[PDB]
Amino acid sequence: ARPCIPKSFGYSSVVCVCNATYCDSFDPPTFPALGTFSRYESTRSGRRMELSMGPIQANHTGTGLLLTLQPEQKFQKVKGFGGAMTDAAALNILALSPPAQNLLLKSYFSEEGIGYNIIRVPMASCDFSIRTYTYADTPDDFQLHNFSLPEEDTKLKIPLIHRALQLAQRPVSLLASPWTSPTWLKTNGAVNGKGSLKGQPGDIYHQTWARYFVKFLDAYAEHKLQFWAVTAENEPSAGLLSGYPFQCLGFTPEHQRDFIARDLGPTLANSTHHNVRLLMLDDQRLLLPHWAKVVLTDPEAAKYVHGIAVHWYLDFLAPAKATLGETHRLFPNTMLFASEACVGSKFWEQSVRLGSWDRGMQYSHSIITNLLYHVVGWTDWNLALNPEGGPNWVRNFVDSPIIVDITKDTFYKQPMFYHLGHFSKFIPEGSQRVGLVASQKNDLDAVALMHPDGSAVVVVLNRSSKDVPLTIKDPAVGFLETISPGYSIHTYLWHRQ
Amino acid sequence: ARPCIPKSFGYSSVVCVCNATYCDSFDPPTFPALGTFSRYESTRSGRRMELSMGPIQANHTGTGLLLTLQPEQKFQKVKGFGGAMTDAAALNILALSPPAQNLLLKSYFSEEGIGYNIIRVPMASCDFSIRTYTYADTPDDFQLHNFSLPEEDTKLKIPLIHRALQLAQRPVSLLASPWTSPTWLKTNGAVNGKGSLKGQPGDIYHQTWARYFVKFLDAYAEHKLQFWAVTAENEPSAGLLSGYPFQCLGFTPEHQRDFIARDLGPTLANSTHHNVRLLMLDDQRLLLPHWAKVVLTDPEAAKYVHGIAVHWYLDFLAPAKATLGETHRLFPNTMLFASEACVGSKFWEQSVRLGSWDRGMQYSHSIITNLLYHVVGWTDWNLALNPEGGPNWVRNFVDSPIIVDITKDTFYKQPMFYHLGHFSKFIPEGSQRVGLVASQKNDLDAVALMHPDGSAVVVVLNRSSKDVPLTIKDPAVGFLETISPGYSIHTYLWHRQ
Ligand SMILES: [C][C]1[C]C([C])=C2[C]([C][C][C][C]C3=[C]N([C][C]4[C]([O])[C]([O])[C]([O])[C]5O[C]45)N=N3)C3=C([C])[C]=C([C])N3[B](F)(F)N12
Ligand SMILES: *[C@@H]1O[C@H](CO)[C@@H](O[C@@H]2O[C@H](CO)[C@@H](O)[C@H](O)[C@H]2NC(C)=O)[C@H](O)[C@H]1NC(C)=O
Ligand SMILES: *[C@@H]1O[C@H](CO)[C@@H](O[C@@H]2O[C@H](CO)[C@@H](O)[C@H](O)[C@H]2NC(C)=O)[C@H](O)[C@H]1NC(C)=O
Ligand SMILES: *[C@@H]1[C@H](O)[C@@H](O)[C@H](O)[C@@H](CO)[C@H]1NC(=O)CCCC
Ligand SMILES: *[C@@H]1[C@H](O)[C@@H](O)[C@H](O)[C@@H](CO)[C@H]1NC(=O)CCCC
Ligand SMILES: *[C@@H]1O[C@H](CO)[C@@H](O)[C@H](O)[C@H]1NC(C)=O
Ligand SMILES: *[C@@H]1O[C@H](CO)[C@@H](O)[C@H](O)[C@H]1NC(C)=O
């Protein structure tokens, strides 16, 4: 292993400094002997996913908090964890020297990093781009004869995706989402602002737009990349808003329902890409459960929809139970998947806060809340940004788990990187959430899952200043006696046989 | 009566221009015989609370939407409507020549204007102040011997409140709310940031803070002003947030519960001000019903709490039914009151948009939703701001129904002014919300109330671009045939006998 090189920028915790010749890394994965548990610990005080091991005790006495595993209480199976290969992310990564590029990609995708198995790929330009382009900017090209991938795909995004997949030992799933259509398909004739597809579902505008999805998948397939899933549109509610500042395409839930039923569903189903999954919504969870009811109560739409994609924006969240919980209850066979998460700032906070433990705790709290309300996966936004939180053509700067300083050939791994890692590294695809009950009221956030091989994983987050003595009971093996320190996150792993 | 002098600033509608010698005004109220209705109309196209009359007829000629009054279905009684006399509002008003000041105060408080009967008064400084002060900044003065009102109170706020009350045809209710305590009572020793009262409820810090409320009410009573109500703290959740940029004081719901039970309740009850009502929360409705459950399930706190004050800023995240509706169901004898609203505070909102019809529709849509979910009153924020949305010492610039241009001795009455007026002018204190049944699904927002004298008032908001043919039925009078134009608000009034 190689430890964190810590640096303070004057906030609550440190970043880990990486360059062309040095980055913090794990030893290859090891399983703890039966009768023992593994612990990975990160702290505000500066510990970064440090490994320790302890015994599983046969007996326990005391008045202390007990968390009891309920392994027969089975919930959702996990698809995975990752982030977005935006134009901004790819530009920042490829501005580093080649050896630094490889250490950044290994940090995310290697078993000696945090084992990401999802990459979200924008279909052409978004706000995290340095220009507005689509794949078909020739006006009224209904046959899409002038459809092509620009350099942002062929020189930045595609080569980094190939390199990520080569570094990963876990199979990686690609997810594609469009922000805007060509402007000649839109009522307002602009990439941004209030505007939807022209005409009505079933018509030439809607069929052309569905064919654009197939052309995108064809072009990526020519580059030997296959997609797990596409979303119907990034944030369809955005294109309903007057003055929306960047790339968008407005759909009401009724418009999305009818576009899926008449155009996108049939076009994908009749293509060579029929095995690609379709996710609906791809938007703020405040729109649930109404959006799900409108789309999935229509059997002609529902038969094409594999899942519901939700967004997380720290500053503006609807309650999980009324949104995620009620949607699962109405549509239990339609998976919920978190397709975009990032920390934006208030008028009083900077876009990037180097070493913010608070922003780390917000990611991990969010991930736990999502896993407790049926969500099968979690996708960060930009894989990397510069210290301004860019580039971004509308200056919609936000934070990222990895901040690249091109002038120093350096990148900084934020607390958010490690908070995400406590899940992504230790919860492989096919893991199933199981029950975990507290003996008493407590300030901790915790979630338990079982790996495909039947082994246990528990993540415990302490967002309080106080150390909390804790016992985890697993009826199969016994008691894990531990302490959750104030401002810490732990992952516990143990064999059950 | 004097009509609106319209001026466009390139937004969706016009402002009404007022100066030292001219402001748009109403004639005294004059209401017609049984069988006649009054209609006040405002439109994006530029009509401003224009009066027309027509017949309520025995025969029904409409074949569209019917709204039927159900006067036997009775809900909440109304406390009233108004806005906040902040330092910023008082500075802006007093920058006008005295004749212009009088036309502005008459616009809000006179029967020649929109009949405000509520003024919210900050207890010392907030963001809408040009400096940081409290009433007791001399440290370790636990008996508050050095408590005093500065010129902001004695020169600006108090004289303007006297003049408002002189001009009002209705009794005006004053509501007080503190942002911060003296910093020597706080854990962080700062006017802002993450910080609460030192120590624990019942101790010297908490007793001093409760005594500060009595000292404030004593000081205003010496100036012959008496309060209807106080809130336990403005936005108590703000003082729980690291780096909160302006005046705040953090309380968890448990801290608010124990402060009310041990200190504020008993201190107010043992004073000459025992008749002043105490409102809890004074914060976003997303905190309901949880905050209400924590405070009101403790009888020692609940016996001092008259009501729950709500702010509008996270309404889009929190459906009324899940927050206001559920709180009413759990605590049906504890009134809900809307104590703060404004547009221009979100990062996607330009601070001031002179003539914004959208911002007008936001006010009226909020007031209707509130009234349909048991809310008894609705209080705007700053009564007046400058064209930048200030002054504000942290540059938290926002919009206001009246914008003062002091360099031209001019003020502008925004669509928000008229949207608020469609309620404030025509729903006096003690009005009762009654049933209004829609015959079919429609795009209108509507609410019916009955005046203390038994006469009817119905407000109809059309946020759609399409004219809606409408019939209103009063079982005791007959059928009102009308049209709700696209982007209009109407108030209908009629005698029932
Ligand atoms: C750069 C930043 C980043 C960003 C996301 C924005 C935006 C977009 C802000 C969206 C605000 C918002 C409001 N809502 C709730 C709202 C909901 O109440 C509706 O019923 C739904 O149909 C729809 O979901 C929308 N969701 N998001 C923006 C608008 C709309 C205008 C401006 C100027 N900007 B901006 F400031 F430029 N800007
Ligand atoms: C890249 O980072 C590494 C680790 O911080 C730097 O290596 C350290 O350099 C200092 C000063 O030369 C030595 O005292 C340390 O012993 C080195 N540590 C290790 C573990 O090798 C390296 O210098 C950095 N590269 C650049 C170009 O700045
Ligand atoms: C205050 O506003 C009023 C109304 O807009 C202005 O009055 C107008 O003045 C012009 C000449 O300057 C007259 O021809 C109009 O007939 C006036 N209208 C009315 C209804 O009287 C007035 O000038 C403004 N005051 C200042 C100083 O500009
Ligand atoms: C998600 C958007 O799709 C992406 O384009 C933005 O860069 C990012 C930050 O603004 C995300 N936005 C949101 O989640 C919405 C913000 C709340 C209004
Ligand atoms: C209400 C506050 O009490 C007042 O001080 C602010 O000026 C006003 C506008 O910012 C309101 N607060 C907020 O908007 C808080 C942010 C919403 C969660
Ligand atoms: C479309 O593509 C064809 C074939 O490459 C090319 O000849 C034509 O000029 C293009 N038209 C444009 C870019 O307008
Ligand atoms: C506070 O008031 C007392 C009299 O009650 C006075 O003696 C003292 O000097 C005052 N302190 C300040 C700083 O004004």
DSSP labels, A123-191: ES--SSSSS---S--STT-TT-TT----HIIIIIIHHHHHHHHHH-SSPPEEEEEES---GGGBTTSSS
**Experimental determination technique:** X-ray
* The pair of three-digit structure tokens given for residue B54, joined into one six-digit string: 């027509």
Q: 3-state SS of chain B: helix, strand, coil percent to 5?
A: 30, 25, 45
Instruction: Quickly tell me which residue has 């703890």 as its tokens.
Output: A32
* The pair of three-digit structure tokens given for residue A147, joined into one six-digit string: 């459809």
Quick one: which of A422, A423, A380 has its CA closest to A402? Answer: A380
Distance from CA of A317 to the nearest CA of B (A): 7
Selected residue of B347, B361, B393 to mutate for chain A interface (largest A Cβ count, 10 A) = B347
DSSP labels, B322-371: IIIIHHHHH-TTSEEEEEE--SS-STTS-S--TT-HHHHHHHHHHHHHHH
Among candidate residues A387, A410, A431, the one where a domain is terminated: A431
Q: Which of B340, B349, B388, B481 is catalytic?
A: B340
Strand partners, A377: A80
One domain, residues B43 and B170 = no
One domain, residues A15 and A58 = no
Mode of pairing for the β-strands spanning B118-123 and B15-18 = unpaired
In the 8-state DSSP scheme, what is residue A431?
-
Residue B247's CATH number: 3.20.20.80
Residue A50's CATH number: 2.60.40.1180
CB A452 within 8 A of CB A435: no
AA letter at A241: L
One domain, residues B194 and B234 = yes
Residue A22: partners with Cβ closer than 8 Å, 6 or more residues away = A2, A5, A103
Sheet holding B410-413, edge to edge: B6-7, B15-18, B410-413, B402-405
Report helix, strand or coil for A6.
strand
Give the Cα-Cα-Cα angle B271, B272, B273 (nearest 5 degrees). 85
Nearest-by-Cβ selection for B347 from A286, A319, A347: A347
Resolution in angstroms, to 1 decimal, for this deposition? Answer: 1.7
Q: Which of B152, B233, B235, B429 is catalytic?
A: B235
In the 8-state DSSP scheme, what is residue B289?
T
CB B191 within 8 A of CB B180: yes
Mode of pairing for the β-strands spanning A432-438 and A444-450 = antiparallel
CB contact (8 A) between residue A348 and residue B243: yes
Annotation says A340 is catalytic: yes
The span from the CA of B473 to the CA of B58, in Å, is 10
* The pair of three-digit structure tokens given for residue B256, joined into one six-digit string: 């608010």
**A chain contacts of residue B237, beta-carbon cutoff 8 Å:** none
Helix (H) or strand (E) holding B15: strand B15-18
AA letter at A307: G
The span from the CA of B302 to the CA of B295, in Å, is 7
* Size (chain B), residues: 497
AA letter at B435: G
Residue A324 Cα distances to A287, A458, B317, B318, angstroms: 10, 22, 14, 14
Report helix, strand or coil for B266.
helix
Among candidate residues A431, A463, A485, the one where a domain is terminated: A431
CB B429 within 8 A of CB B117: yes
The span from the CA of A350 to the CA of A389, in Å, is 9
One domain, residues A143 and A289 = yes
Among candidate residues A397, A431, A465, the one where a domain is terminated: A431
Distance from CA of A347 to the nearest CA of B (A): 7
**B chain contacts of residue A286, beta-carbon cutoff 8 Å:** 316-317
Mode of pairing for the β-strands spanning B65-77 and B468-474 = parallel
Overall domain count for chain B: 2
CB A206 within 8 A of CB A233: no
Instruction: Quickly tell me which residue has 């109304």 as its tokens.
Output: B78
Instruction: Tell me how many helices (H) and strands (E) chain A has.
Output: 13, 21
The span from the CA of A491 to the CA of A448, in Å, is 10
Instruction: Quickly tell me which residue has 């395409």 as its tokens.
Output: A249
Neighbours of B355 (CB within 10 A): 22
Instruction: Quickly tell me which residue has 């069929």 as its tokens.
Output: A207
Burial of B78-95, coded b for 16+ CB within 10 Å and e otherwise, reads: bbbbbbbbbbbbbbbbbb
Task: Give the torsion through C-alpha atoms of B240, B245, B248, B254, to 10 deg.
Answer: -10
One domain, residues B107 and B150 = yes
In the 8-state DSSP scheme, what is residue B34?
T
Of ligand 5's listed atoms, the one at least distance from the Cα of B128 is 7
Orientation of helix A357-372 relative to helix A415-424, angle to 10°: 30
B349 Rama sector, left if φ>0, alpha if ψ -120 to 50, beta otherwise: beta
One domain, residues A463 and A375 = no
CB contact (8 A) between residue B317 and residue A349: no
AA letter at A193: G
DSSP labels, A389-426: S---TT------SEEEEGGGTEEEE-HHHHHHHHHHTT
The span from the CA of B341 to the CA of B364, in Å, is 11
AA letter at A15: V
Give the Cα-Cα-Cα angle B235, B237, B242 (nearest 5 degrees). 120
One domain, residues A372 and A478 = no
* The pair of three-digit structure tokens given for residue A129, joined into one six-digit string: 């781009």
Helix (H) or strand (E) holding A450: strand A444-450
The span from the CA of A43 to the CA of A49, in Å, is 9
The span from the CA of A381 to the CA of A84, in Å, is 5
Half-sphere exposure of B216 (CA within 13 A, CB side): 27
One domain, residues A247 and A332 = yes
Q: Looking at A303-414, list the stretches that DSSP marks H as alpha helix, in order from N- to C-terminal side.
A: 320, 326-330, 357-372
Closest residue by Cα to atom 8, ligand 2, is A22
CA B199 to chain centre: 34
Give the Cα-Cα-Cα angle A174, A179, A185 (nearest 5 degrees). 120
CB B240 within 8 A of CB B178: no
Report helix, strand or coil for A325.
helix
One domain, residues A436 and A426 = no
B21 lines ligand 3 (CB under 6 A): yes
Closest residue by Cα to atom 31, ligand 1, is B348
A146 lines ligand 6 (CB under 6 A): yes
The span from the CA of B420 to the CA of B366, in Å, is 10
* Phi, psi for residue A247 in degrees, rounded to 5: -50, 125
Quick one: which of A323, A474, A388 has its CA closest to A128? Answer: A388
* The pair of three-digit structure tokens given for residue B138, joined into one six-digit string: 């001399």
Q: Looking at B115-203, list the stretches that DSSP marks H as alpha helix, in order from N- to C-terminal side.
A: 151, 158-167
AA letter at A106: K
CB B125 within 8 A of CB B133: yes
* The pair of three-digit structure tokens given for residue A337, joined into one six-digit string: 């998947």
Strand partners, A482: A470
Peptide bond into A391 cis (omega under 30): yes
Task: Give the torsion through C-alpha atoms of A425, A434, A316, B393, to 10 deg.
Answer: -70
Give the Cα-Cα-Cα angle A286, A291, A296 (nearest 5 degrees). 145
CB B47 within 8 A of CB B491: no
* Size (chain A), residues: 497
The span from the CA of B246 to the CA of A223, in Å, is 53
Annotation says B340 is catalytic: yes
* The pair of three-digit structure tokens given for residue B192, joined into one six-digit string: 């802002």
Nearest ligand to residue B2 Cα: 3
AA letter at A424: S
Half-sphere exposure of B337 (CA within 13 A, CB side): 31
The span from the CA of B39 to the CA of A72, in Å, is 66
* The pair of three-digit structure tokens given for residue A268, joined into one six-digit string: 């994908």
Residue B201: partners with Cβ closer than 8 Å, 6 or more residues away = B255, B258, B259, B261, B262, B263
Helix (H) or strand (E) holding B98: helix B98-109
One domain, residues B303 and B329 = yes
CB pairs under 8 A between A and B: 27
One domain, residues A202 and A321 = yes
In the 8-state DSSP scheme, what is residue B270?
T
Residue B22 Cα distances to B6, B405, B428, angstroms: 12, 15, 27
d(CA B331, ligand 1 centre) in Å? 34
Half-sphere exposure of B170 (CA within 13 A, CB side): 27
Burial class for B280, CB neighbours closer than 10 Å (0-12, 13-18, 19+):
buried
Radius of gyration of chain A (CA): 23
Strands (E), B58-209: 65-77, 80-84, 118-123, 173-178
The span from the CA of B307 to the CA of B304, in Å, is 9
Strand partners, B38: B53, B493
Radius of gyration of chain B (CA): 23
Half-sphere exposure of A334 (CA within 13 A, CB side): 28
In the 8-state DSSP scheme, what is residue B240?
G
Strand partners, B83: B119
AA letter at A169: Q
Q: In terms of residue numbers, what domain contains A440?
A: 35-77+432-497
AA letter at B148: S
Residue B263: partners with Cβ closer than 8 Å, 6 or more residues away = B201, B202, B206, B207, B209, B210
One domain, residues B232 and B328 = yes
Mode of pairing for the β-strands spanning B80-84 and B478-484 = unpaired
The span from the CA of B281 to the CA of B179, in Å, is 13
Selected residue of A241, A254, A312, A347 to mutate for chain B interface (largest B Cβ count, 10 A) = A347
Mode of pairing for the β-strands spanning B432-438 and B444-450 = antiparallel
CB A336 within 8 A of CB A375: yes
CA A204 to chain centre: 34
Strands (E), B79-166: 80-84, 118-123
